[PDB]
Structures are given as structure tokens and as C-alpha cells.
Symmetry: D2
Subunit: 290 residues, 4 copies
């Protein structure tokens, strides 16, 4: 990892770094915000500032949410580090959408391990986020915990990637906490999902929450927090939370996935930054900061 | 005034508006956040809901600070509305820099009233901010107060245009409070101001805080709050706050103009957003909200 | 019709125009080259000057071909005016591809009269090129013949457009001659064609050269000239010219449709500009200029 | 040197090359057109296919002139190869205009050897075009002559380079012929030129044709051909050709600089392309091709 730029924000700082990925086969960009607890003064306690991984949506770069979500404030408030990875491989030699669409090429890896040859050469985004990046970061810094108690969250496609990595690593407690903002909950029946599935994979069960959640035994009081505005333009056609609610009905996860609607809200970061506080509090209590 | 878009944010709302400026002759875009206090239940003497005017710097649109400085949270915390105006005339039929610089022209009005024929045609940003815009808003919303007790704040070019329109209308108490983030405190002696002063104006006395303060009568406990980071790339050559600290030395205004350098911060909105809470509190106190 | 800009080229003029289209309900842009013969001096028979309509491909604007095809020179050499219309309706008011593809939507009308309700409102491009623009030009300029004996050509989407209009208006002698550069001939059974069809029309027999030509009685020694580089990146997937050939077999059109292979050529305008002189003479003979 | 793209144009081929320059310490892009005369037969003499170097103007890339001047047709007609170098260093580790203007830095090297430190590291464009590029080209291909029997020409900032380099290498017969399309002939006394000099050089003398020509003994029939439409928007303030005529009076060069005004022509490539056939004839003659 090499430091590309560091910005002082709130009590700590935002660091934008790059590294050659071995799963992406390309140079990848990642931003991380280190709280004021880092740079503190005590700590014989040791390496244990929790970490929240935030996956972004279609089109995004790590900078979008770094700049418009305002997680820094909450990171300083409860005591956690927050990582913003990119949305896909990116590059001149990277495959891209054959029609120039923004819902599928670079900037839209849908956090999957692509098997189709045009893409398989770089689109191993599931590995990158749940395996490589965590180890790559721990090896660059280690005061921080990027592998034990970490929480995962996201926005839209990024929200989908959150609920997905959480449910696939539940039996091993991979992520201690999971929340999402305007998540694509059932990609086998939504336009962008079916598209990415067809493009990156053949012809799906694995990778689709509404199907993966019926083969998973619930434990204790673990819940999934979801917020989604009713004035969101993509609600009706792309994000159909109600579906993940009927896939949870009469299942052990029943009543363990709350989908707070909330009136007048967008799909924009005016919507995300608004509920970030509540999500920061939700994750803090699951990471052990409150 | 017209409504382009209405987004719900925090407890209140953000409103995208366009209107036809007689001061610019051209159409103009403005953004405004109405607090959670508006939309509530009652409140009597409430008409005194102050309003903060935030001016932006070079190249900016009303959207930048609207999305990157999270004022809305502060707005709800103290109960004030905030307006984000544009930075220049803007349009196809409007003049622009002859060398295509982002320094001068559209997005670079420098909050002056243009005299030079080419620019004079539409560049009446001073009269636009301090005259037409306030009154146009009060006629569209009137409850809200864009005319009596209001504060003015800004970033860089806006920071200059903040300290300037405050000092000018000081005798008449046009603005109750005034702060700025990394402002251009003495345009004369600095390239950006020097260009805007030669291009929009001829050949300067007015429109220059370091000149205008030696002759203005300071009142009571009034002061100007300023923040600028010492890692600001433009500090040393485009915005030297220290020139105010000297121009204020030996004046009725000395000691009532404070500049806080703060180690490690940028000229970016990562810096602006870090000190928006302090500034918001500064205006809260002076606007009688607290 | 309004004059936007004029550039003297060769011995004549390139005139960039705009006009409010009734088939489009939007202001449309069109370029036209008036040859040395216009401006010349005498000869009573004025209307004589024929016209060539050059239809552009996906993504193009009238400026592309005007700048890189070098038609002006051939225009002056033979005495014809050449018209370059736009490729589709334009504006925010005008609908666009839902995924951002250059593939369909704006810059991609496919010279069709749409029926599917979202685009049907502006995308009446078939009528715009064959019905409205001609009359529009004739009314602005009249010396120049835009309706009687005229030729039509195109590149890729524009070659398809050229051949389709020539065939549909053939029994009525709508066009005296026709040719294409790397055209799409079988819109059905081809990705860009199929997508335009599904998107603009329902479910396409009409509008398809390979299905129409089977029901059009051939006359005299009329012929369609077609060039295409064997190194065209789209040849095998998007533009299978052999199909037109295979269609024409067992049809009275047999032997009257020649596709010249031409080794090493691209799909770019380096290819087009090379075979423009041969196409310009083809048209000259059929329009009676030589 | 390596090949990027390679397509067929007319009877020859255009070739886009890249190579690691030592004058620029950067990778530079270069386009070249090999006439049908290359790719033919034996020829004992052969090594006589001359070359013409076309320097471009402000903001240009080798692709502008390659796509809009049509030189390829002339090259095949007379039998010469033509090279289109780039206009500046190009790159993020390469300095640019501090105010983001388009008339200085990157796209605006002015074919000078920069001495001022920021730019001096990559702006050695004079040496690049007159010494590095030809030797590198000669080395990559060797039938072709890029060092001896060569002609130089240009457009605007390019015309100036063409004219300046021609005079400076006159004592050594550096170039056999020289012409220009709307050149800036007196860089001092003209805006873009003064900015170019002040930024790249200190204090100019040794790079101004109007000053250079007064100290070179004219030989034989040598002349300089220039074309510049009377409708060129920059004619009166940037390119004042009349000035080179005055510097030529009472000089041995008088009568050998012919400026053909040309009525109604723009500064655009519709202007350039129109008179390219005439300029090719001139150079061809001077290169012993006819």
C-alpha cells in the first residue's frame, strides 16, 4: 500500500491509498478514515479500534461517500475506523460494458466473482473485499482490527454487497454487524441484478440474499438494519425490500430485518448522510463501543 | 422563483430553485435548506427565524457546499435556514475568460459589480447577493427572515465576499455575524483578486477588507471568526489572512478579528465540514438562537 | 430555419443550421454544403443542382462527416449540394437510454418513427429525414433541388437508413440513387437493430432492407453501391452485409447490389473519406451530372 | 518506438506511434502517413521518399490534422510521407498553466526549449521536433528520409514553429521548403506569444521570425508560402502576418514571403483542408517530386 494523499478531517484523518491487487490484477484505490482514537496517547490495551466497511453503489468511487456521507463525525464519536473501497477493477485493460452502460461495466462489479472470460480476468470483487483488502490493510497498518470484529454496510449495489457478505459469513460470524441504505435485496428478479448475473456469471443462488437467507439458521438477537426513502426513484423497479421481507417470513430470520421506510427521502447522499448517525450507533453497539 | 427539485434532509428540506435575476439579467440557481423548525407545529415570535448566507469559492455551484459541508445538521441544531447562492452570471450568452481560465469568468464573479463593458453586462454579483436575492426569497416565502437578522459566511472567494459585504454594510448592521473559511482577505496583492480587479473593474479601494477596515468604526464586542488550515495549498500566495491581522493592528477593529490556523488542514471541504459546527454555533450566538 | 454559422470551404460554403422540427418537437441541427455552382453566376435552369443526403451513424452529430468525409471537394467537382442531418432528437426534454448506452437513445434514432410511448413523443426520425427536412430546406433556400432527383447515402446506422429509405420510396422514385458505407442491412438478427426495434416499436418487417427488398420489383439498371473494410471491428457481429446479398438472391434484385470488400479498411472516417470520391461519381452519373 | 493503431487510408496507411522521449522525459504520441509509394516495388534510388512535418496549433493532438486536413490524398498524388507531431509534453507529472488556460502549457508548447524550472523539465519541444523525433523516426523505419530532403509546415502556433525552425536551420539547409496556414509570425507583440515567452523563457530574440529573418542571407529562389483567411477571428490580435512583410522590406528576403489573404475563410480545418492541395504542390516541387 502507498499513501496517495492524506486529508485532515474532524479529529483524525482520511487517507487515500492504492495497492496492486492480486485478485483484481490491477491497481485499486481505497480510502480509509482513521479516528481521533488513533493518534491518541494511551493504549496498552492494544490493536482494537473496530472497522466498518462501506461498499458504494453503481458509478461510485471511494470519494463519493467519503465526501458526502460524513461518517468521520460518527467514527470520532464512537471510536471506529471506516474503509471505503472502490466499486470495480477499473482500467484500460479491464473489460467494460459492450454498450457503454453505467449499470454494468467498470464502476459496477456488483461484488461478485465473475466466471465469464471477458470479465473473469479482473472482476473478482467478492474476493477483493472479503479476503484481500482486509489482509492488505492489516498488513499496511499492523491498533486496528480489520479482521475480527468488523461491521459491513453499503448503499444500493453497495447495500446489496453488504447484506450479501454478512449472510455468507454468518455461520462463522464474519461480520459482527450489518446495515444497508437503499439495497438491491433480490438481484435475480431486478433489472440491474439479472444483468450483472447474466454478464458476470453463466446462464445465482449463492450471491442472492433472498435465496441465501433460507438456508441460514438465525442466532440470538442479530438483526439487519435497513433504511430506504419512499421518494427513491429506483424503489419500485430496482430495490424491492418487501421481497426480502417475504423471504424472511416464516423463517428463523423473521422479525430480524427491519426496513424503516421514512417519508420524503431520496436515493441521494442527502438520504444516506441523514441516517448515517443512527447507523453509526447501531454498529457501535454491535462492535462493542456502547 | 421556481422549484427544480425538493429533497428531504435531516429534519427539514433542501430546495433547488431557479429565478430570473434583474441584477444579472440572466437566470440563476440557488439552494436553500429550511430547518426542522419550519414544518413543525407552531412557534410565535418565530418570524425571527434567522438565515445564514453562505458564499462559495472559484468554480463552485450551489451544490458543492450543499452536499459537502453538512450545514443542515447544524441548521436543525440551532434553528436557522441556510442559503447557497451561485458564483457568477453563467450562460452561453454570458462572457467568460479569454484564455479559458477557471480563475476568471463564469464561476468566478468575485462578488463585485462589473464596470468593464464585456463583463458589466451580467456580472452584478454584489448587487445580486446583497440586494436582489434576499428580497426575491422573502417574496417567495413570505416566517423566514432574509432581511433583518442574518449572518454571512463563505469559503475562499466566498470568504472574501463574506468579510467584504459585512464590513461594507457594517454601519447599517446589514449582517449580524460574519465568518469565513480560508478567505482571500486582501485581493489587492494577490493574483486571483488582482485579475478580477483588473478584468471586472478598471486600471479597488472598496471591495478590499485590508483597506476598508482601517477606516470603519468598530462596535462593542463584534468580531470576525476565521479558520484556515496550514496545509492549505493556496495559503501562502492567494489568501494571506495575516495581512488582516496587520491591517487591523492599531485600529478600533484590532483584537476583534480572529484567525485560527489549525495544524494539518486543507482548503478542501474536508476542512470546511470539520469547522462548520463551530462556525454554526458562532452564528447561533449572534443570531439569538442560543 | 436559422443560420448558426457559415464557413467557406473549397469553392462553396458549409452552413450549420437549426430549426424547430414538427416531427421532433425539438430544435434540430443540420449542416449543408453549397458548392461553387451556387454563387457561380449564370445558367437559367437553376433547380438543376441535385442534393445528396448523408445519414450518419450512432453517436454522430452533423459535424463529424462534414469535417472528415471531404465531401465538399466532390460536391464542387460535380455540382451537387450535400446535406448532413442529425442522428436523433436532442435535449433533456427528450428521453434517453435507461442505462446510458451510446447504443440506443439520443444519437441513435435509427431513422425510425417510434411508437413505444416514452420515445414516440420525439423520435419521428423516419418522417424527419424523408418528409419534413426536405420541404424545410426547400422553403428556406428557394435553384436547389431537395425533393425531386436527389441521392441518399449513409455510414453504418446511416447506411441502413439510406438503403431503407431508397427501397421504401423506390416504387415512387423517391431517390434517384443510393449507396452505403459499412451499413447495417439486416436490423433484425443484429444487436443494435434488435434493440432499436424492441425499444422504438413494439414486440418490424417494414424498415428492414432484407425483408422489404423481396417485395420490390427491380427496374432498369438501378443499383446499390456498398463499400466496407474487411478490418471493420463490427463487421461480423453488427453489420453482416452478406445478408443483403443472400436476400437479393432469388429476387429480381439479383446482380444489382454490389458489396466491395476492400482489404485493410476500418469503420472509421479514414475508410469513409477514402471511398467518398468513388461514391460521389456513382451519384453524379445517376443524378445526370456527368 | 511502437505501433498503437494502424489503418488504411487512400492507398497507404496512417500509423499512430508512441515512444519514450528523452527531450520530454515523457511518452509522446506521433502520427505518420505512409503513401501508396511505400508498400510498392523495388527502386534502386528508393531511399528518396521525402517527408513533410506538420506542426499543429493550440490544444491540438496529432489526430486533428490527420482527420481533418486530408493530406493523405496529396501524399499519394505526389509521393511523400507526412508526420504529425504532438504539441506538448503531456502528463500528470508534467507542468501545466497555473490558471488552467488553454493557451499555455500542454497543448501549448510553442515549439520552444523552455528554461524556466517548472516547465524546463519536459518542455524541450524545439529539440523534440527538430532533432529527437526525426532521428527516432529514421531509426525506427530505416526508403524514407526524415532528416535530409524534408519540408516543414504548420497551422497557427504550428505555422509559427514551421516558419521559425525553417529560418533557424537555413544556414544548414535544415529544411528544403516551408509554408504555413495562418501563422503567428511575431510572437513578441502578440498575447499568446508573450505569455509563451515569459513562461518558458526569462527576460525571445532567437525565436522570433520577424527578428530572425533580418539576419539571414537569402539564397536562390527560396520563398515562404502562407495562407490566412480574412475571416480568421484571431487575425487582428494574434496572427499578424503583415508584420513579417515589414521585417522583410529593405532585406534580402523581400519578395520571397507571399501571404495569400483568401476571402471569407475561417481559422478552422475547412480553411486548412481547402488549401492543403496547393501547399502539397509547393512542397512536392521543392522536394523534387515534380
Amino acid at each position: 500500500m502507498k499513501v496517495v494523499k492524506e486529508f485532515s478531517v474532524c479529529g483524525g484523518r482520511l487517507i487515500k491509498l492504492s495497492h496492486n491487487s492480486n485478485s483484481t490484477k490491477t491497481s485499486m484505490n481505497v480510502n480509509i478514515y482513521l479516528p481521533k482514537h488513533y493518534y491518541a496517547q494511551d493504549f496498552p490495551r492494544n490493536k482494537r479500534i473496530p472497522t466498518v466497511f462501506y461498499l458504494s453503489g453503481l458509478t461510485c468511487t471511494p470519494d463519493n461517500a467519503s465526501e458526502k456521507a460524513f461518517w468521520q463525525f460518527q467514527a470520532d464519536k464512537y471510536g471506529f475506523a471506516i474503509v471505503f473501497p472502490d466499486t470495480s477493477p477499473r482500467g484500460d485493460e479491464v473489460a467494460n460494458d459492450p454498450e457503454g452502460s453505467w449499470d454494468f461495466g467498470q464502476g459496477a462489479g456488483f461484488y461478485l466473482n465473475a466466471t465469464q472470460e471477458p470479465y473473469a480476468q479482473h472482476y473478482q470483487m467478492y474476493d477483493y473485499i472479503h479476503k484481500e483488502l482486509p489482509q492488505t490493510l492489516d498488513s499496511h497498518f499492523n491498533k486496528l482490527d480489520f479482521l475480527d470484529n468488523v461491521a459491513i454496510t453499503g448503499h444500493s449495489m453497495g447495500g446489496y454487497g453488504a447484506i450479501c457478505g454478512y449472510l455468507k459469513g454468518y455461520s462463522g460470524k464474519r461480520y459482527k454487524s450489518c446495515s444497508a441504505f437503499a439495497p438491491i435485496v433480490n438481484p435475480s428478479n431486478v433489472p440491474w441484478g439479472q444483468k450483472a448475473f447474466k454478464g458476470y456469471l453463466g446462464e445465482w443462488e449463492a450471491y442472492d440474499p433472498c435465496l441465501l437467507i433460507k438456508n441460514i439458521r438465525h442466532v440470538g438477537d442479530d438483526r439487519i438494519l435497513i433504511h430506504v426513502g419512499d421518494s427513491d426513484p429506483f424503489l419500485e423497479e430496482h430495490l424491492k425490500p418487501e421481497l426480502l421481507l417475504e423471504a424472511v417470513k416464516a423463517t428463523s430470520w423473521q422479525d430480524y430485518v427491519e426496513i424503516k421506510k421514512v417519508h420524503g427521502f431520496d436515493h441521494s447522499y442527502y438520504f444516506v448522510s441523514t441516517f448515517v448517525p443512527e447507523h453509526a450507533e447501531f454498529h457501535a453497539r454491535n462492535l462493542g463501543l456502547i
